[PDB]
């Protein structure tokens, strides 16, 4: 499996690593990929796209890198299962509610409730691992 993410301070990166840990504990292989290094063709071969990005701008996806990536794959993912996650700060998930609506609008099947954690995981570390386990159980 693959996990593609954007992280500005490492909070979403930590989430990505914990989600990976959960998938691995479930017995499956998974690679975590920073959005700057993503191979689009290889990502599209996956049965489940696990995508993560923190809340940026005013409740939007990161603009220089993550956003363009979503735009590029947008027309090539109808029917694909996707799992979404990200870290946030002062809000309550607006950017993620929009991210979920967006992917649904592209015809994706959002497999689990998006995982959102405030700042660095910490107490929420297990929540990250468990989200990975849910994805692996599909
Ligand atoms: C310029 C900027 C904009 C942000 N916009 C939001 C926002 O609209 N809502 C929110 O809850 N947090 C927002 N945050 C907070 C980040 O989402 C939060 O610090 C998160 O833990 C960052 O994760 P990361 O290290 O993976 O980037 C913003 C942070 C920055 C740097």
UniProtKB/Swiss-Prot annotation:
Organism: Clostridium beijerinckii (Clostridium MP)
Designated name of the protein: Flavodoxin
Needed co-factor(s): FMN
Residues annotated as domain Flavodoxin-like: 1-136
Family annotation (PROSITE patterns): FLAVODOXIN, FLAVODOXIN_LIKE
Stretches assigned to coiled coil: none
Any one GO MF annotation of this record: oxidoreductase activity, acting on NAD(P)H
Function: Low-potential electron donor to a number of redox enzymes.
UniProt keyword annotations, A-Z: Electron transport, Flavoprotein, FMN, Transport
Assigned protein family: Belongs to the flavodoxin family.
Gene3D superfamilies linked to this entry: 3.40.50.360
InterPro entries for the chain: Flav_short, Flavodoxin/NO_synth, Flavodoxin_CS, Flavoprotein-like_sf
Superkingdom in the source lineage: Bacteria
Pfam families the UniProt entry points to: Flavodoxin_1
């Amino acid at each position: 499996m693959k996990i593609v993410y954007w992280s500005g301070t490492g909070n979403t990166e930590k989430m990505a690593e914990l989600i990976a840990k959960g998938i691995i504990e479930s017995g499956k292989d998974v690679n975590t990929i920073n959005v700057s290094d993503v191979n689009i063709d290889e990502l599209l071969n996956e049965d489940i796209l696990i995508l993560g990005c923190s809340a940026m701008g005013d409740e939007v996806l990161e603009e220089s890198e993550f956003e363009p990536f979503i735009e590029e794959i947008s027309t090539k993912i109808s029917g694909k299962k996707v799992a979404l996650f990200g870290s946030y700060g002062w809000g309550d998930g607006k950017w993620m509610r929009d991210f979920e609506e967006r992917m649904n609008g592209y015809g994706c099947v959002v497999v689990e409730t998006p995982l959102i954690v405030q700042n660095e995981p910490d107490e929420a570390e297990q929540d990250c691992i468990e989200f990975g386990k849910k994805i692996a159980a599909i």
